[PDB]
Structure formats: C-alpha cells, structure tokens
Amino acid sequence: PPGGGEQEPPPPPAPQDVEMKEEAATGGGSTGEADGKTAAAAAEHSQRELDTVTLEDIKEPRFVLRALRMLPSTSRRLNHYVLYKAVQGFFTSNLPFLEEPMDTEADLQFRPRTGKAASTPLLPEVEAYLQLLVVIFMMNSKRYKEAQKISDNRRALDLVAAKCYYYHARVYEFLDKLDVVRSFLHARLRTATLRHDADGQATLLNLLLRNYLHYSLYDQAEKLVSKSVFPEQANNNEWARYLYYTGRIKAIQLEYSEARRTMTNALRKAPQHTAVGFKQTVHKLLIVVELLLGEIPDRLQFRQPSLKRSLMPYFLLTQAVRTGNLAKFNQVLDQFGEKFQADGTYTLIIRLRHNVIKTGVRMISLSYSRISLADIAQKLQLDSPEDAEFIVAKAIRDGVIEASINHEKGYVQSKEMIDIYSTREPQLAFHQRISFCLDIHNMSVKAMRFPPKSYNKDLESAEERREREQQDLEFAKEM
Amino acid sequence: GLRQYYLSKIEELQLIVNDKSQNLRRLQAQRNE
Amino acid sequence: MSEKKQPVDLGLLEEDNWDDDNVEDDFSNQLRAELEKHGYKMETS
C-alpha cells in the first residue's frame, strides 16, 4: 500500500490534465474551425491530429460520453470532464464503450469530430497489447467506422477519413484476409476520383500496392494506366513510399534506367526523424539496382551508426563484384543465400554474373593491348579457353571493347582511342547540367514573391505639408 | 429530383475558382509596388 | 508538427575527414604489408 501511493496517483491526474488541452481543446477548436469554416487543411488541424497520434502512440469512458445535443450539453462537456476526473479520483471506472455515441446526448453534429473521436478509441484498441481489442471487435469498431465512412459532405471528412482507412488496412494486416480488403479498396477508389478530385488517390494507391506485391503478383497493367498517379497533394510523406513502390515495380521487370532516378528521389524525400525502418530497405535496393545498371560504383561509403550493422553482407558483396574475380562471387552467394532469401532479394542478385564478367573483360581490355586468349581463361577462371572467344565476341558486339581477334593465331589486339576532348560528348555533358542549373533559378524565384504580402503601406511624403509649401512659395513670391 | 447532377457541376466550378483567385492575388501586389 | 512516423520493419536490432576512396579497402582483402609480400617473395629467387 505504501509503495503504490506516490507513483501510482501521479499517472491519473497529470495525463488527463495535459490531454484536456491536447485533444479536448483540439476537438473543441476543430468543431468551430474545421466544421465552422472553409479553411479546410488550415483549420482541419491535420498536424494537430498528427501530433496527437504520434504522442499518444508512445503514451475513454469519460471522453466517449461527450454530449453536444444542445448548447447546455456542449457547455456541459467541459465541466463533465472535471466531474469524471473527480469521480476517477474518488471511484474506480470501468463493449460498453460503443453504444455511448448513440446515447448520452452524443450529438456532435459534425462528422469530422465524431470520426476522430471514434478513431481515437480504435488506435488504443489496436495498440491494446497484442489482444487486437478482442480481435474482430476492433474490426467491428472499424466496421462502425466503415458505416461512418458511408455516412456522407466531405469538406473535412475526406482528409479525416484518409488516416481512418489507413489504420483500417493495418487491422487486417495484423490478422486475417487481405483479398477482400483489396476488393473494398478497388471499389472505394472509384468511389472517389469521381467526385471531381478529392485526394485519397495517394493513400488508397499505397494501401492497394502495400500487399499486392506481398502476395507476390507483379501486376502492372493498371499502374501504367492509373489516373491517380498525380494526386500532387501528398504532404511530402505519401509521395516517398509511392515512388518507392513504383520504382521497385519498374525495376523488377528488367528496367533499370528509370528506377534508379525515381527511387533515389524517393529515398532523398525521406524525413529527418531518427527511425530508419524503411530507409534500410530503400538503401539496400538502391544499391543492388545500381550494381545491376552497368557498373556504377555505388560505394559512397556508408558508415553511419544506424545503417552500419545491417548492411554488413552487402559491403562484402560489393567488394567481390567490383573486382574481376568470379570465385569470390560464388563464395559470397553460397554463404549469404539464406540471409538474402529472408530479405526477399535472392532473385535480383542471382543474375549478377553477367555484370561481373563484363567488368572483368573491360578491365582486361583497358589494361593490356595484345594478349593471348590462352591466359584470359586462366585470369578469369572460366576453365576453358574456347568459350572465351564467344564471350569476347559478345563483348565486341555491344561496343564494350573495339578489340579485334586473330582466331587462327589466338591473340587479341585492341585499338587505341584517346583524345575524347575533341569528341562531341563533353558538350552534351555540360548541356545536361546547364539545363538543371537554369531550372533551379526559376524554381527558386517562383516561390520568392509568395511571402511578400500585407504591404498596403503606401505614402509618398505627406498630406498637409503641401499647403505649407504652397503658402511659403506664395510668401516668397510676394516679396 | 436531379439535385445530384447540379451539385456535382456547381461543386466542380467552385473548386476550380479558388486556385485562380489565389494565383491572381499575388500578381496584383507586384504591380502596386 | 514533427509527425515523422513510418509503419513497418524498423530493424538492425538498434570520424574520417579524408574523403573516401574505394581502393583503400580493395587490398584489405589481403596483402597486409608490402613488407610481408616482398620479404616472403624475394627469398625464392
């Protein structure tokens, strides 16, 4: 009894108090602001929702019996908060928290408000240990939310519901089927994108793609023809994961040129927060695909504390691939195949042999000028000299090297191509970035004039000084 | 009735209007200064 | 403000002012010392 009298009492009052201005005041201001004005995003308090989600994530009977049927009930809500606090201080409070929104005069008269209120129970119920709020009961609460979803008037409800049917997906993600979630999402997508433009063409796309790939079906038809590619309103958080998904989709189909740029943009759109969960994966792929595309080094050495422990296999891998040796590649694959399979990346790196052999032959071509093929096999350990002829021939085909070969003799001789400065390519190289440096100036200037505003102050010299000047001039002209 | 059709049309027009209004409000200032 | 959250798979179970060059780690594969190679190669011939 003595132990629980000094640290247990504090938990009750202080969190309630600091919540009274965190979500109670937030709800009160949103009701008269989001549902009281057309500021939308401004008075929608999506960042207040954000903060009250992130803080409560790492953080109900009183707040569920909120009443606002009449003005006295709405006024009462706030004194009833203190009344329930006093009851909690004196007495011990408590399914029976789902019928209250239909009772206790609960007439918010704003869907934007009752939605967030309902979702707030769902988030704790989702995070109620691993119980899943008695499983389907959380889903049933979200089934209630889905009934609310069909309620209507979306000058706020839309951007309120986004988060709702984003956690809704997580509910099934942690449990049972997802196929019928896909059916629902497909329907909901055209339920939107038809009410002119309403957004959600960002969140629903990511929700659909999150486990479309996880089920391991690489359908792409609708992605190339999707009209929701361009919501243009993503808060710079949705856009990153959307670009990541489309980049992996593009890269898995033997397309490397565009995936690098799009997914590098996606990675560099990532925020500054300490969490590095998805950045681990995007980095890992962003350097596998760069190894695949030609032989760009990618070895922009990463030793940051967060990423150091994870990417230890990959460092060893790049070490083998950069050199022309091939036994090292097998000695790495047979060692880390299971680890790569656990990462879902065995299929991409299993086709890396061609890149290794291209690097080796290019290095051999650049180093020597006249070498017998009776040693190329020994240096690259192909175990046979005759097929080295075919390998070199294929290399010459694609313009890898311009060396000729005397088949009757056996030695390979290479041409000499120097003085690239006179070639037209450096002009192209300069132009490609002249374009960028000209674009950035216009981009910067475009947004400079937005902050200058409220400059109504426009006065020249005076108002009544003109009469004094005229009088002085007349007096001077009189004499 | 046919209210839904009319709602759709009027809503689309009003949704467009605001962007234009905004992109003109900035333009007026420069000229004034 | 500072929402900064991502849903899945946080992992990993929790300097140098000289610009990095790849070559430094290449011979980190072996040849610990030029000394050792020269000393233990020259004796043969």
Side-chain angles (χ1 to χ4, degrees), chain A residues 1-5 9-15 24-25 27-29 32 34 36 39-43 61 67 72 86 89 96 101 106 112 115 117-118 121 124 128 147 153-412 421-452 462 476, chain B, chain C residues 7 11 15-45:
Chain A
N153 306 323
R154 294 114 64 94
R155 275 328 104 223
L157 277 315
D158 226 16
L159 295 174
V160 156
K163 245 298 200 193
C164 296
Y165 35 79
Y166 151 70
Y167 275 112
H168 177 81
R170 308 270 286 104
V171 183
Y172 300 88
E173 182 65 13
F174 254 69
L175 178 63
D176 57 3
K177 59 89 179 176
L178 194 137
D179 290 345
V180 200
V181 165
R182 291 332 208 211
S183 202
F184 162 60
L185 294 174
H186 277 82
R188 190 57 200 282
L189 189 58
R190 300 300 299 277
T191 287
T193 330
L194 241 74
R195 196 138 175 178
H196 216 24
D197 155 50
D199 198 22
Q201 307 172 19
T203 56
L204 306 181
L205 273 294
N206 294 287
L207 292 159
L208 182 140
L209 293 176
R210 190 175 182 87
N211 201 110
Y212 217 47
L213 277 71
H214 163 278
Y215 274 149
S216 308
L217 33 133
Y218 280 135
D219 293 5
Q220 178 261 355
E222 69 90 16
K223 296 91 199 171
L224 68 92
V225 71
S226 286
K227 65 203 182 313
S228 304
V229 173
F230 41 98
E232 297 304 338
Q233 313 319 317
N235 298 320
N236 296 344
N237 200 2
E238 186 278 333
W239 207 271
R241 32 190 163 83
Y242 167 70
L243 261 61
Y244 162 71
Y245 281 136
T246 181
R248 187 173 182 177
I249 285 307
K250 189 59 56 62
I252 207 62
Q253 276 173 346
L254 293 182
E255 181 61 35
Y256 308 139
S257 85
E258 187 70 358
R260 183 192 47 84
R261 59 152 312 283
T262 177
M263 181 170 121
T264 304
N265 203 344
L267 162 68
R268 182 214 302 160
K269 287 248 178 182
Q272 192 265 331
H273 186 273
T274 305
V276 297
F278 269 43
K279 283 183 300 178
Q280 281 279 355
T281 299
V282 47
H283 250 109
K284 188 180 294 294
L285 219 65
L286 189 146
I287 62 174
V288 167
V289 304
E290 235 172 11
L291 286 176
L292 263 304
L293 202 178
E295 195 218 342
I296 312 190
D298 111 88
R299 187 183 295 275
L300 297 174
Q301 285 215 347
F302 308 111
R303 289 97 57 92
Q304 293 177 335
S306 60
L307 297 174
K308 183 188 293 92
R309 189 196 303 186
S310 43
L311 295 174
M312 280 322 287
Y314 280 75
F315 179 65
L316 295 174
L317 177 78
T318 176
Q319 178 49 44
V321 66
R322 208 65 170 170
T323 72
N325 195 323
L326 190 149
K328 271 74 176 175
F329 172 86
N330 312 138
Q331 287 178 354
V332 171
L333 262 293
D334 71 336
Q335 186 49 51
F336 292 136
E338 296 309 306
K339 173 60 196 295
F340 280 125
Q341 284 150 2
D343 302 324
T345 177
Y346 194 90
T347 177
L348 275 167
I349 73 170
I350 204 63
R351 70 191 86 157
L352 214 59
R353 276 191 31 180
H354 189 252
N355 287 113
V356 172
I357 195 66
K358 284 210 294 321
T359 308
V361 68
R362 178 188 296 111
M363 190 156 307
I364 292 300
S365 62
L366 192 147
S367 172
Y368 304 164
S369 159
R370 186 175 177 181
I371 174 61
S372 162
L373 57 87
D375 293 331
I376 310 297
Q378 288 73 354
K379 194 158 309 193
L380 276 186
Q381 63 184 178
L382 272 298
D383 296 330
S384 59
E386 65 277 7
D387 59 356
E389 301 179 354
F390 307 140
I391 302 300
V392 173
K394 280 309 285 169
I396 298 156
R397 160 70 72 79
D398 294 331
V400 168
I401 182 62
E402 297 84 4
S404 165
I405 161 74
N406 185 339
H407 194 339
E408 165 265 344
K409 265 304 178 57
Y411 71 96
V412 179
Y421 197 80
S422 302
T423 305
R424 265 211 62 199
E425 55 94 20
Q427 188 260 332
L428 313 169
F430 280 133
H431 163 55
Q432 183 204 8
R433 56 205 67 197
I434 281 292
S435 53
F436 171 75
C437 198
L438 285 169
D439 292 331
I440 179 170
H441 171 95
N442 312 322
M443 170 261 268
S444 159
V445 160
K446 266 297 288 172
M448 184 278 289
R449 201 51 173 78
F450 287 61
Chain B
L2 192 57
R3 49 139 304 273
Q4 217 296 122
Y5 169 79
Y6 258 40
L7 178 61
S8 166
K9 299 296 183 181
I10 294 156
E11 162 207 358
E12 292 166 17
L13 295 174
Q14 185 63 60
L15 294 184
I16 269 65
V17 189
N18 324 98
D19 291 345
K20 186 177 181 180
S21 96
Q22 293 300 320
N23 288 290
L24 188 147
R25 237 255 55 187
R26 169 201 64 260
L27 286 198
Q28 294 174 339
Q30 289 157 248
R31 197 201 73 80
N32 298 344
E33 61 91 17
Chain C
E15 300 174 3
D16 302 6
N17 285 329
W18 33 96
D19 67 311
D20 64 326
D21 33 37
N22 305 358
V23 288
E24 186 97 21
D25 300 308
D26 280 336
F27 45 82
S28 91
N29 89 292
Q30 232 236 350
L31 216 128
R32 275 90 236 238
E34 201 265 335
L35 181 262
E36 80 203 8
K37 282 308 167 291
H38 161 67
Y40 314 141
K41 181 265 316 167
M42 72 147 305
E43 27 68 79
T44 51
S45 38

